[PDB]
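Regression test case RT-17, inverse folding.

Input:
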């Protein structure tokens, strides 16, 4: 059935149906009940702060943070009134209506609703259903006149709370019992969510096209409906019990400049989609696939052995057998035995993991989102009113075509849609900072954790390529594509639920055994000591305090750090001396016209062995290999992409494990199949190796080059802010008569300097992407290929010897198979970057390379 969204006010009475007093999983049967509203079937909204595992003091902003990743905003007063709770409800209703306004989101919701948790746990015997567990059953309190008195159990799929202490930290939580999680083991379980629709993340698009302003790179706020949908994909993964853990991406923390973060799971990167799944190696891709498939084999074994329900005799065995068949897409034969169809499972697995994706959804709803999970995140903002249809609609969100806001996501642009958001007071924002001290005169700088380089540790990547391989007659090789055509997902019928939803009513919960997570704050500051002045210092030397009036530019970095009226500039000597020039009022307009024009010329500097090089990057940042000293062009011309890297990573290139070939005496066909299966497995290992190199490149090198791009945007903005301050000061120095006659437009100066910046960032983008790809193609790929050419020779020797040891059992085609092995192992698999990315910008850089 088509997805129905319910309507209700917070003040509406308890009907024991769509509005109930509920005992949530982490309440632990302690007599605490919450007013819960059924927004859709199996999904409940509770307009209350998420308190479980926290302390009351946590809801206030202190000197600590919960997550090093996040710019955390605190507000204890959020949701402290009945009216505030009603707003929350109405906004959630509105967001859910926006989700189902397009088919794709409707599919996501219908799959959540119908993806009921398996009536069991790992502790539950294979022959039984059990609804007496916290991941399946939730309790409601009935309050009527003197006739019936008790608790009553209902089935639920998703319970949505208000935020925890951190308003903008939306999280989806799964239920753990006895150190294990049902939502990671094929069963599935009641998913919980803490959510706040009003405080949204901010991102930027620093890697784009167009040299004109058109308000490029000015900042973009996120669409609350997309954020919710990101969490709904987690909910989906959890209800299908496929939200598994494998080898995570763990940040390297052995250097001061390296970013600090918790481990990043593949489930998180699959959810985001886009370029990110390529950061999860093909070995780990298969590992996750196998664990999911094995879990599904457990459930299919359970359904074939299930006969009774222990908790409730009112539970109809056939109804739930028919529903779990419909949920997991099993096939039933003649006798009634359920089994797994691989073609069904793969379609299901790929739709849940690679179909429903933040990138796929955003690109279908015409909503701008960040480029990667590894994109820098700016300070969050408050959306004034989401219920205001002149600002935010169900159909089009922020990008409303009547307001001329649809074109290029203008409705999300911070510089255009000023009236949609309010900036947040930094007194309420907690940010994980690194206090950096350089060697009376000791200089300290508070540096955001977000502005540090993300570099994946060596232990992030799998070594499964080094393991041996048993090649038998039925050995099947796999490629799991980190892609799924979105139009096929929208039009697919097999994923739509066939069997009707069972009634939510059941027996009350008596077993309250649950693992509740515990959260504590850590200090938000860390002091480091170092000898090197790098980017953080060089960027800071381009800033000035707000009280300083007569600032002047300097090409001396030391003088800029020491003098607070001195600001470091990386442009030419002529630009600096022109900017520090004091003229009579009559020639001022000419000077403003000259210096602004000079800024644009200086920023657009790019002389022309591939693509174009921007020469001031070294002076601007001093990134990597002391690039501010000497001449950057010369230093690049010798070494190349390397000099810009702050850290040269240790590459993981495993020696490919030997193939062990099975013998089949008096069976010709099984000998021929084995030789064939070994050659197809060779292609798999080549593809996997390429995937391992790309995985490391994206998370260890390409991220460093992204930080340089973000550094250059800041550096160029600092130079514009310095020039604007100088012009403004020089303007105000004149008399009131003088100011009147020779006037300039401050909006004109802003837009012109901004347009030069976008043109410059374009040049830097082109150059840096060139560096990144160049590094992959020169310093990474060849080394992998070299070990694959060793593996080929080893396999050549192995297969040829195998043919000899079996020459009599073939006879008719021994020389045929020998020439088959010879020619197939001369075909080297071509490396194609289009398999891993869809950026087009990086695709062309790869194509230009010979
Ligand atoms: Zn997530």
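Golden output:
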């Amino acid at each position: 059935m088509p997805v129905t969204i319910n309507n209700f006010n917070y003040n509406d009475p308890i009907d024991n149906n769509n509005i109930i007093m509920m005992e949530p999983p982490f309440a632990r049967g302690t007599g605490r009940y919450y007013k819960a509203f059924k927004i859709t079937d199996r999904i409940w909204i509770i307009p209350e702060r998420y308190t479980f595992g926290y302390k009351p003091e946590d809801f206030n902003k202190s000197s600590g943070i919960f997550n090093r990743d996040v710019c955390e905003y605190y507000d204890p007063d959020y949701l402290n009134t009945n009216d505030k709770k009603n707003i929350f409800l109405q906004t959630m209703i509105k967001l859910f209506n926006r989700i189902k306004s397009k088919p794709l989101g409707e599919k996501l919701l219908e799959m959540i609703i119908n993806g009921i948790p398996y009536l069991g746990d790992r502790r539950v015997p294979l022959e039984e259903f059990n609804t007496n567990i916290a991941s399946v059953t939730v309790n409601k309190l009935i309050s009527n006149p003197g006739e019936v008195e008790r608790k009553k159990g209902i089935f639920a799929n998703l319970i949505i709370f208000g935020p925890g202490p951190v308003l903008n930290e939306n999280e989806t939580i799964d239920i753990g019992i006895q150190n294990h999680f049902a939502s990671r083991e094929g069963f599935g379980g009641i998913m919980q969510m803490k959510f706040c629709p009003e405080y949204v993340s901010v991102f930027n698009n620093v890697q784009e096209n167009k040299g004109a302003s058109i308000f490029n790179r000015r900042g973009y706020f996120s669409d609350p409906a997309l954020i919710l949908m990101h969490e709904l994909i987690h909910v989906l993964h959890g209800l299908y019990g496929i939200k598994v853990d494998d080898l995570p991406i763990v940040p390297n923390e052995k250097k001061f400049f390296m970013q600090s973060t918790d481990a990043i799971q593949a489930e998180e990167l699959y959810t985001f989609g886009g370029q990110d799944p390529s950061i999860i190696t093909p070995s780990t891709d298969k590992s996750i696939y196998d664990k999911v498939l094995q879990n599904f084999r457990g459930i299919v074994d359970r359904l074939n052995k299930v006969l009774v329900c222990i908790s409730d005799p009112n539970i109809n065995i056939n109804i739930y057998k028919n529903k779990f068949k419909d949920k997991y897409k099993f096939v039933e034969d003649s006798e009634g035995k359920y089994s797994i169809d691989v073609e069904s499972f793969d379609k299901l697995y790929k739709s849940l993991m690679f179909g429903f994706t933040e990138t796929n959804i955003a690109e279908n709803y015409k909503i701008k989102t960040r480029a990667s999970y590894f994109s820098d995140s700016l300070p969050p903002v408050k959306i004034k009113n989401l219920l205001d249809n002149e600002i935010y609609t169900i159909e089009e969100g922020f990008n409303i075509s009547d307001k001329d806001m649809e074109k290029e996501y203008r409705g999300q642009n911070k510089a255009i849609n000023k009236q949609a958001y309010e900036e947040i007071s930094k007194e309420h924002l907690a940010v994980y900072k690194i206090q950096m001290c350089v060697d009376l005169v000791l200089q300290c700088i508070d540096v955001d954790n977000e502005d540090l380089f993300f570099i994946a540790d060596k232990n992030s990547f799998s070594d499964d390529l080094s393991k041996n391989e048993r090649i038998e007659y039925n050995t099947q090789s796999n490629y799991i594509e980190n892609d799924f055509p979105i139009n096929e997902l929208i039009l697919d019928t097999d994923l739509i639920s066939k069997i009707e939803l069972p009634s939510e009513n059941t027996e009350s919960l008596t077993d309250f055994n649950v693992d509740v997570p515990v959260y504590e704050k850590q200090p938000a500051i860390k002091k480091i000591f170092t000898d090197e002045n790098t980017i953080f210092q060089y960027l800071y030397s381009q800033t000035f305090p707000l009280d300083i009036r007569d600032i002047s530019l300097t090409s001396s970095f030391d003088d800029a750090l020491l003098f607070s009226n001195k600001v470091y500039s990386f442009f030419s000597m002529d630009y600096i001396k022109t900017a520090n020039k004091v003229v009579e009022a009559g020639l001022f307009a000419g000077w403003v016209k000259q210096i602004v024009n000079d800024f644009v010329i200086e920023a657009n500097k790019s002389n022309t062995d591939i693509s174009l090089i921007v020469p001031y990057i070294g002076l601007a940042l001093n990134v990597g290999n002391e690039t501010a000293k000497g001449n950057f062009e010369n230093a690049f011309e010798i070494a190349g992409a390397s000099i810009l890297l702050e850290f040269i990573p240790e590459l993981l290139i495993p020696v490919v494990g030997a193939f062990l070939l099975e013998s089949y005496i008096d069976n010709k066909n099984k000998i021929i199949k084995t030789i064939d299966n070994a050659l197809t497995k060779r292609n798999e290992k080549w593809s996997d190796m390429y995937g391992l190199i790309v995985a490391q490149w994206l998370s260890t090198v390409n991220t460093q080059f992204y930080t340089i791009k973000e550094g250059m945007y800041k550096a160029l903005n600092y130079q514009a802010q310095a020039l604007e301050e100088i012009i403004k000061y020089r303007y105000n120095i004149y008399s009131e008569k003088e100011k009147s006659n020779i006037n300039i437009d401050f909006n004109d100066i802003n837009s012109k300097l901004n347009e030069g910046i976008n043109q410059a960032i374009d040049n830097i983008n082109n150059f840096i992407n060139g560096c990144s790809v160049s590094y992959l193609m020169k310093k990474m790929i060849p080394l992998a290929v070299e070990k694959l050419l060793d593996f080929d020779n080893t396999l050549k020797k192995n297969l040829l010897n195998y043919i000899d040891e079996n020459k009599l059992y073939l006879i008719g085609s021994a020389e045929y198979e020998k020439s088959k092995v010879n020619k197939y192992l001369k075909t080297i698999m071509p490396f194609d970057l289009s398999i891993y990315t869809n950026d087009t910008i990086l695709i062309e850089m790869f194509n230009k390379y010979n």
